[PDB]
Amino acid sequence: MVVIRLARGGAKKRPFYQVVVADQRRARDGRYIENIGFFNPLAKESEEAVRLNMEAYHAWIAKGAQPSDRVASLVRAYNKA
Amino acid sequence: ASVLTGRVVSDKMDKSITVLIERLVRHPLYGKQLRRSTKIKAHDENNVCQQGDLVRIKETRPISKTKAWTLVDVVEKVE
Amino acid sequence: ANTAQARKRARQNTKRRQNSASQRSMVRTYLKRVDAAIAAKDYDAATEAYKKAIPVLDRMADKGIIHKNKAARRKSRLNKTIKGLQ
Amino acid sequence: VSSYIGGEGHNLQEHSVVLIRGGRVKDLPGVRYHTVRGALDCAGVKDRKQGRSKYGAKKPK
Amino acid sequence: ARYIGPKLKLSRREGTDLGLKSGVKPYDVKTKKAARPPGQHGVSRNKTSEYALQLREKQKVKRIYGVLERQFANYYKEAARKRGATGENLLAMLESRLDNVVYRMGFGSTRAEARQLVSHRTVMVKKAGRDEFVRVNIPSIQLQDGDVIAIQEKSREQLRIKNAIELATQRGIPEWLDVDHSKLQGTFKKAPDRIDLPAEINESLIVELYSK
RNA sequence: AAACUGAAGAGUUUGAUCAUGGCUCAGAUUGAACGCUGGCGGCAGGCUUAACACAUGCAAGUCGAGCGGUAACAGGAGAAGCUUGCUUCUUGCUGACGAGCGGCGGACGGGUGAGUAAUACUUAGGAAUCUACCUAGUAGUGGGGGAUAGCUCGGGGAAACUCGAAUUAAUACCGCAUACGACCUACGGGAGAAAGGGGGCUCUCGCUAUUAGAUGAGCCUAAGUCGGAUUAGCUAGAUGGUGGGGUAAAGGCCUACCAUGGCGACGAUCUGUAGCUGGUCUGAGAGGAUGAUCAGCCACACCGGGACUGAGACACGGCCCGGACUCCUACGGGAGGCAGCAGUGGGGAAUAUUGGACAAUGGGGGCAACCCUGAUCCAGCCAUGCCGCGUGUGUGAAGAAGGCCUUUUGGUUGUAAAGCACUUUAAGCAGUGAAGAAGACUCCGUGGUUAAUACCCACGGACGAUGACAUUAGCUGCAGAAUAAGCACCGGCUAACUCUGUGCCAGCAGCCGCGGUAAUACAGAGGGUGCAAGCGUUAAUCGGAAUUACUGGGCGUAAAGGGAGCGUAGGUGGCUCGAUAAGUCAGAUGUGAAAUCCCCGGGCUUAACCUGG
RNA sequence: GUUCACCACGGUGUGGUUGAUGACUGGGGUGAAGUCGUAACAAGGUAGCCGUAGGGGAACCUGCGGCUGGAUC
Structure with a gap:
């Protein structure tokens, strides 16, 4: 299915996630929609x-x-503010 | 869709014509444009046009092994 | 096969394939009946064989032995050729 | 191919395993390679002091 | 790395004073040389070339600021990437270096001592806008407009800063720096200008050395 | 506001000159190797060769809330030998659970670049398709049957496994019954499903038929896309048509018949080489070279071939057949495939640990609990690269000694040293110590649901279960200059010069050349120059090279006008008035992935690095 | 199960392309106190050169035609 998840970037021990819409079967940092x-x-x-x-x-x-459980809670804590 | 215009260089197949589609292509390094032509096989259901006519064809689904364009307008005949 | 599940899928594949091959053969023989009737040019026999080929065609298409599109195509085309027999 | 043994003195002989790099000798026709001194079996130059790394010579202590 | 060996032969090779010694006594008597470059031969025949002039000027600037070739070539690359005159931007960066700033502010007698003061985590820096000092040990930190420099509370009574200050008093304090000796603090109010920096360093020579 | 900034030449042909013209050099870069040397950290990178062969461990499971069950395990209830606190035997009763039937997954993720010059890739479009899980709907989920694995009974086999008889369950399988859609229709009518489980009649997870989305996949078109003509003709299912078959779907995809077509100097065919791209390097640019790491697409999985199951495979850790190779064997027969992660042998100039955890982001299964995940997140090794820091800092002269040179007395090493006065970055020792965590579960409240104050769903609070890294990052103390400098070069290009030894020898050398008894060119020493935890050499690409010249060259004599003409294709082409708008120009719209590059900011102590626009 | 159709392996025959080697043989280059001459450069001692033919140990010579990139005139 289509998922909304985080693709890790940044560097070692210093992550920076991108919220991407992606096909579930693709690699975490691979092709996205x-x-x-x-x-x-x-x-x-x-x-x-x-x-x-x-x-x-x-x-x-x-x-x-x-959505994944991380992006879902991210929206949960981003719309309450 | 997509419509091309060109002369009929062959018609000797049943429900089939070859169309010469001229195009100008610019040389990537030397900047001049060269006359380039591609032969496109088109569908001529009623066998109307003969060789030498200027016709318009449009892209469609494949009709045969090499035929995916169909005649849509004969605009001028040979003399 | 190297894992338990691979082996289980292999034997499951064998059983499923025998079950489906029997029904594929049944579809093929009910269609061969209508093809022989048509090749004989006999409208009555062609229609009578077609009426038994219909509920096998579209029943194994529902089971998945053939595709619904294949069943529809064979139904339509056989009916066309049969109606062409006067 | 033919390669040049640079430096003063060498231990090379028949069936010696050597390492070969590029670089032709100007006044030697047909010699287009140099033998690396200190690489595999070609010893470095014994009492070399100035350009030692060019001749595989360890640092005197 | 950094240069460790004797410093006056650097100035002797450059033919001028590089400020590599504290201004406790004049450069002439400090060495009784600088009429001739170091070594056996010194005053030579076979006059210098354009490349020799360019190299000597680049080494002059490098030895003034204690910066080695890789850092200084990155400096030139950024200076030529930045809008404006390349040599002016390179001098601005070399003067905005943290060790040079603390030297010019007078907490170190010379630039090498100022660098060794910064590296030993005795100098704290507060970026403009930030309400907090941080102890830094990176001498090549560039300072922006309004950055504040202070001395670590553990080392405010240093017997070397307490004469570096009085020596800076005799040497002269730049206007683009604001120094409070009582609280041992400074402010980098603006990058220095080419009309403020001495008009004896020919940066055109460096810019023409760095163009093949 | 900005993205708009960029361009050097030298040596060497001559007695000398100008030109021509080659060769060589100074630059940048690298998945580099080698030689000498080597302190630390951050962040990257690390078999480019043998798509060679692979020992060993791991890389794909999960669900008992589909099912019969009970191999182990742990309890619970009774039998209690009670041996009085030893202790066992019956029971799926419960947590659970091996094997087994069943579902979902295993078609992803990961690897490699052999093949492939075009069923590829890039760009732009198209119509004749299918699409599990997910979203929103619609019509349902009714009623029966016959089996069968495990479990038995008996064999066969060295094993791998296997044969027969009996036989139980299911969301396994098959009829029958209905059918909003859907399928066929001659449009009159025909035929086509399913399955139950779970929580307290309901809700929920499912199942069936289907519609529209979304996602993914298949198919088509046009353009672009390496070298060779010392490869010019190539094609017979070939090119087109009809009937039929085939496919999910167009189609010579297949077939029978009919016609004689189709492609080619705008390069077909045949050949060599090659994964393509975003990008990377170089360059002022135009170009030239290239396609590691990151991302997209393709192809492959020991070699050849065939398919099965499935939404999806002609399937990397699936099946069958054949082959080569390795292994086991009781000689009858069997097993296997690291181009997954480590790792071994081998090849090579050369490329790492048989590490940890699922804590985080994801992926598979499950109602959850939870399990799996060599993806990933980390750790290890390596100066392989980039970036950063250190190896101390000041003061110190009758300018000590020693080395070297010298006109033998001066110069130089050199404030350099010593002596004094300090400092402690990084390393070490001791402490303290964030953030990476998303707050699971449980309790309460609210709203929806309902016959319901249940259950379930969602929302809102309280609570702190959860960290491999890890002895974390950082911060604060202690100690003491203590733990830390090498490499190349010094005739010119090209920054830096003298002695001694040698004597066209030994040797150097990129080029020009040097070496013959007073060598700034060899070798060693002083002194210096440039880089610096690196420095050189070799390999390789571009540059300089305007030396293939589009930007941007030439051809009287330096290389270069065809012996001359006629002419085919092609290229180019007078004047005036109109049409057209293909080229051209402008505008709009869609697209040109992200990353990269550049500009403006932001976050790591700075930088590298990461990141917003 | 049997049989036919398709087809992989494998086999046979005849060619094409191409690598490495081959007695011997051709020219090309490099090497010094060599042998034989002296062809070219001056009118190089017969002006040279080009095409072609013949001849000659060898540079070459000779004929025919051409050129000036020829002195002297």
Whole structure:
């Protein structure tokens, strides 16, 4: 199925995830359908740690995409603010 | 769709014509344009056009091993 | 096969394939009946064989032995050729 | 092929396993390679002091 | 790495004073040389060439700031990538180096001592906007506009900074730096200008050396 | 605002000159090797050769909430020999669970580049298709049957395994019954499903037929896409058509018949080489070279061939047949495939550990609990690269001694040393110590659901179960200059010069050349120059080379006008008034993946690196 | 099960392309106190060179035609 998950980038011991819509069978960092945000696990209090296009996220939800438990909680903690 | 225009260089098949599609292609290094032509086999269901006519063909699904274009408009006949 | 599940899938494949081959052969013989009737040019016999080929064709197509598209194609084409026999 | 043994003195003989690099000798016709001194069986130059790495000579202590 | 050997023969090879010794006494009596470069021969025949001039100027700047070739070539690469005159930008970077800034602010008698002061985690830096000092040990840290420099509380009473200050008083304090001796603090208010830096370093020679 | 910035020449033909013209050099780069040397850290990279052969371990399982069950295991209830606190035998009763039937997965993820010059790739489009899981709907899920694996009974086999009789369950299999859609229709009518499980009549996980999405896959078209003509003609299912078959689907995909077509100097055919791309290197650019690591596409899985199951494979760790090779064998027969991760042998100039954890991001299974995951996240080794830091810092002269040179007395090594005064980065020792974690479970409340205050779903709180790395990053103390410098070069190009030895020898050398008894060119020493934990050499690409010249060269005599003409294809082409809008120009729209490059910012102490636009 | 069709391995025959080697043989180059001459450069001592033919140990010579990239005139 289509999933919304995180593709790891950054560097060793300093991850930086990209929130991507992807075919489930593809590699985590491989081919994806749309990049709809990012996530900085380690970040400073005065810097954007989570950005995520809500319109495209909702479009893919209605369309059939299944978020992972990480991106789902990321939206959970990003829309409550 | 996609429509090409060219002369009929062959018609001696049943429901089939070859169309000469001229094109200008620019040399990647020397900048001049060279006249280039491709022969496209088209479908001539009613066997109307003869060789030498200027016709228009349009892309369709394959009809035969090498035929995927069909005649859509005969615009001019030979003299 | 190197793992237990690979071996199990192998023997399962054998059983499934025998079961399906019997039904594929049945489809082929009910179609050969209609083909022989058509080759004889006998409208009555062709229709009578076609009426028994129909509920085997589209029943094994539902089972998956052939595709629904194949069953529909054979149904339509055999009916066309039979109706062509006066 | 023919290769040149540079430096003063060498231990090479028949059936000696040597390492060969590029670089022709200007005044030797047909010699287009140099023998690496200190590589496999070609010993370095004994009392070399200045350009020792070019002749596989260890640093005197 | 860094140069460790004798420093006055560097100035002797350059033919000028590189500030490699504290200004406790004039450069002339400090060496009784600098009429001739180091070694046996010194004053030679077979006059220098354009490449010799370019190399000597580049080595002059490199030895002034204690920076080696790989770092200095990255400096030139960035200076030519940056908008503006390449030599001006290279001099601006070399003057914005943290060890040179603490030297110019007077906490080290010479640039080598200022570098060894920065490297030993005795100098703290506060980036503009940040409300916190951090102890840094990287001498080649560039400072932006408004960066603050301070001395670690553990080493504010140093018997070498307490005369580096009085020596900087006799040598002269740049305007683009603001120094408070009482609190042993400084501010890098602006990168220095080519009209403030001495007009005896020919950076055109470096820019023409770095063009094959 | 910005992305808009970029271009050097020298030596060598001559007695000398100018030109021509080759050769050589200074630069940058590398998955590099080698020689000498070697302190540390961050981040990357690491079999380019034998798609050679592979010992050993691991790389794909999971579900008992589909099923019969009970091999082990742990309990629980009773039999209690009770041996009085020893202790056993019956029971699937429970947690669970080996093998077995069943489902889902194993078609992904991972590897390699052999084949492939085009069923490939890139760009742009198309129509004649299928699509498990996921999203939203629609119609249902009714009622029967015959089996069978395990389990038995008896054999055969050295093993691998196997043969027969009996025989139980199911969401296994097969009829029958209905059918909103769906399929065929001559449009009158015909035929086609399914399966149950779970929580307290409901809800839920399922199953069936199907519609629209989304995803993925298959198919088609046009253009672009290496060298050779000392390869010019190539094709007979060939090119097109009809009827038939075949496919999920167009189609000579196949077949019978009919016609004689199709392709080719705009390079067919035949040959050599090769995975293609984003990109990478070089270059002022245009170009030239290239296709490691990261990402897309393709192909392959010991070699050849065939298919099965399935939504998807003609299947890397599946099947069958054949082959070569290795192994086992009781000689009758059997087993296997590291181009998964480690690792071995071998080849090579040359490329690493038979490490840890699923904590994080993902993937498979499951209602969950949880299990699996050599993907991945980490750790190990290696100066292989890039970046950063250190090996101390000041002061110190009748300018000590020693070395070297010298006009024999001066110069030089040189503030260099010593002596004094300090400092402790990195390494070491001791402490402290974030972040990577997403808050599982449980409890409460709210809303939906319902016959229901249940169950389930979602939302909101409380709670702290969860870290391989790891003795973390960082931070703070202690000690003491203590633990830390080599390499190449020094005639010119090309920065840096003298002695001694040697005597066209020994040797050097990229080129020009040097070496003959006073060698700044050999070898050693002083001194210096350039780089610096590296420095040289070799290999290789571009550059300089305007030396294939498009940008941007030439042909009277330096290389170079065909012996001359006629002419085919092709290239190019007068004046004026119109049409057209193909080229051309402009605009809009869609696309040109991301990463990379460049510009503006942001985060690691800086930088490398990461990252937003 | 049998039989036919298709087909992989394997086999047979006849050619093509191409690598390595081959007695011997051809020219090309490099090497020094060699042998034989002296063909070219000056009008190089018969101007040279080009095509072609014949001849000659060898540079070459001779004929025919051509050229000036020929002195002297």
